[PDB]
Ligand binder design. Sequence first.
Ligand SMILES: Nc1ncnc2c1ncn2[C@@H]1O[C@H](COP(=O)(O)O)[C@@H](OP(=O)(O)O)[C@H]1O
Ligand SMILES: CC1=C(/C=C/C(C)=C/C=C/C(C)=C\CO)C(C)(C)CCC1
Ligand SMILES: [Ca+2]
Length: 341
Amino acid sequence: LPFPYEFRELNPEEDKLVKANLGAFPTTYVKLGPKGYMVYRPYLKDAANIYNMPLRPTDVFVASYQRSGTTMTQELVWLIENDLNFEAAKTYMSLRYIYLDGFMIYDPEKQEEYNDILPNPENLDMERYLGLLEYSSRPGSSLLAAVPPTEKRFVKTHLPLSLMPPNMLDTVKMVYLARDPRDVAVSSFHHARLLYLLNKQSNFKDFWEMFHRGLYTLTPYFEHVKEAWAKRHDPNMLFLFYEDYLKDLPGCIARIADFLGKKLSEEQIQRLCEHLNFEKFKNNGAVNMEDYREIGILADGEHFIRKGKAGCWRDYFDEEMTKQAEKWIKDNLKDTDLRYP
Ligand SMILES: Nc1ncnc2c1ncn2[C@@H]1O[C@H](COP(=O)(O)O)[C@@H](OP(=O)(O)O)[C@H]1O
Ligand SMILES: CC1=C(/C=C/C(C)=C/C=C/C(C)=C\CO)C(C)(C)CCC1
Ligand SMILES: [Ca+2]
């Protein structure tokens, strides 16, 4: 099948704002498709393959706009399918799942320019850093197609449905997570700091201006969410809210199990709840990506697992931003049944 989408460079306005947040970063963006989803330029080379990637009936996807609960979900989804074999779940998350669109943030043609954004390049564990770059060159598709049939595939992605095989849900199951845009904005701001993506200069307002305006990775934020929303009625789609994980974890697990075709006992659902305790998770080496810190590519004072709180966007928004945020979220939920807890 051919890729039904074209792309356009950013116009002056758009580009001006973006460079005000990610100027220092080597990878540039491009608007893909009619909705103009923001994708790192490299994505283009594999775009068509992903659109046509061969799916398998046993494939399980954990999708979401980034920073909405992907990690928590992957861990639960993995345990449930592998009969709560906590022992075997101790291997790195990035090894148990395939991050479909995780490659695009790296542009090989710019290797040199990358370490320059690191406070200290002379202190990198080169044997590892370089290996990271290599893996990060392998297109998403290739990594999926490499897994033999006798191995269940666990895919992770922040790609909207429109960029993946349409009708895919006829073959694979997916769990899409969503979270309050505002809290997502915040978490993303810090995550971008974690990997040295933002000009050490700019602040959060700048980031937010870029975010709700559809100029950040994989946004427009609402089109992304709405796409999965419209498919929640499907038997292979499970739409969840990050807020509910905090409100009723025991009940969220139940739903997932029921969804993935399992039956956990009060004990299993409970046994999983303790395993997902924030502090216990935040310190879990298999899922906190802290191994990366050894490499030398994580910012001091940042962590892949931060607070795990809800509604703390209020500590970052000023009255001005707050109004503009309300109007924005208000305007995208008009004439749609999409509602956040
Ligand atoms: N076990 C857990 N329980 C609650 N929140 C968790 C969690 N593990 C990670 N998180 C939170 O989930 C967000 C990451 O989302 P994702 O995995 O999709 O990128 C972060 O939000 P915060 O930045 O608000 O802390 C992170 O701290
Ligand atoms: C390879 C590579 C990098 C690291 C990418 C990482 C660490 C990705 C994992 C991201 C996650 C897990 C969050 C989204 O779900 C950085 C940007 C340093 C610069 C250059 C090459
Ligand atoms: Ca350098």
